[PDB]
Amino acid sequence: ASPQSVRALLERHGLFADKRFGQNFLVSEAHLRRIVEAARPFTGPVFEVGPGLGALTRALLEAGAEVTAIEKDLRLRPVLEETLSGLPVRLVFQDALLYPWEEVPQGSLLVANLPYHIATPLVTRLLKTGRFARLVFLVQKEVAERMTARPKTPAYGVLTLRVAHHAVAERLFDLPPGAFFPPPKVWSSLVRLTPTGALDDPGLFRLVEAAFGKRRKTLLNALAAAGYPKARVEEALRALGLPPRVRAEELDLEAFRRLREGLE
């Protein structure tokens, strides 16, 4: 609710949160409301990864969502059981990487608060299922930048292309450190993904992973390192009108698909 509310709730449960705690709790009601708005309409059940103290959980329920809140930090069990007491919510303590995503109804909604820098494993797991109608991510600003990056920019990489393959992305707004307690060192952002129904293309992503394997290598050399024969790659690049020493970061999703087809 605000820094003293949170601190007092955590202390009741013998917890101390500073910048090392592992998460950052929403204390901004204005931002809370905007997040609920981003997730509408509630046309499928919501799976909320990282409920924190349950602030968003409560707001989602009040807006008519059905929510399954999935929390990795077992220390928050007494806190959430209290804050969610008497509410129609399912509370699960589990690493979201292990949650049975293949069980969720097709058309479900995913809302995830992922405060850390490397979000790629989980985002990839969720998108590969093809089971969500909408995914809303509250992430570090730099992660949102990667998810929505243009070619030839610092943020551009495998995660950009994974997102683009499965979904249309929107960076909706940023959130300052002061919206959270403890305040994080970086700004956060809210990103909405609307899946297209595209499922994995595993051969495409073996190529894309290889292409971005080493930052300061040409695409030719990066693919050679993963066992794509240079002679075959050279020819494929020639056929596409690409520079012989073109770099992975210069290629868009369409170009990666054409390259993959060329090599097959």
UniProtKB/Swiss-Prot annotation:
Keywords annotated in UniProt: Cytoplasm, Methyltransferase, RNA-binding, rRNA processing, S-adenosyl-L-methionine, Transferase
Keyword Signal tagged: no
PROSITE patterns linked: RRNA_A_DIMETH, SAM_RNA_A_N6_MT
EC number(s) reported in the record: 2.1.1.182
Superkingdom, taxonomy of origin: Bacteria
InterPro entries: KsgA/Erm, rRNA_Ade_diMease-like_C, rRNA_Ade_Mease_Trfase_CS, rRNA_Ade_methylase_Trfase_N, rRNA_adenine_dimethylase, SAM-dependent_MTases_sf
Signal peptide, first to last residue: none
Amino-acid positions noted as binding S-adenosyl-L-methionine in the UniProt annotation, renumbered to this chain: N24, L26, G50, E71, D95, N113
GO terms under cellular component: cytosol
Main location, first listed in the record: cytoplasm
Catalytic activity: adenosine(1518)/adenosine(1519) in 16S rRNA + 4 S-adenosyl-L-methionine = N(6)-dimethyladenosine(1518)/N(6)-dimethyladenosine(1519) in 16S rRNA + 4 S-adenosyl-L-homocysteine + 4 H(+)
A GO MF label: 16S rRNA (adenine(1518)-N(6)/adenine(1519)-N(6))-dimethyltransferase activity
Compartments, record wording: Cytoplasm
Pfam families in UniProt: RrnaAD
HAMAP family from the UniProt entry: 16SrRNA_methyltr_A (MF_00607)
Function (record text): Specifically dimethylates two adjacent adenosines (A1518 and A1519) in the loop of a conserved hairpin near the 3'-end of 16S rRNA in the 30S particle. May play a critical role in biogenesis of 30S subunits.
Family: Belongs to the class I-like SAM-binding methyltransferase superfamily. rRNA adenine N(6)-methyltransferase family. RsmA subfamily.
Protein name: Ribosomal RNA small subunit methyltransferase A
Organism, scientific name: Thermus thermophilus (strain ATCC 27634 / DSM 579 / HB8)
Top-level taxonomy: Bacteria, Thermotogati, Deinococcota, Deinococci, Thermales
Gene from which this protein is expressed: rsmA
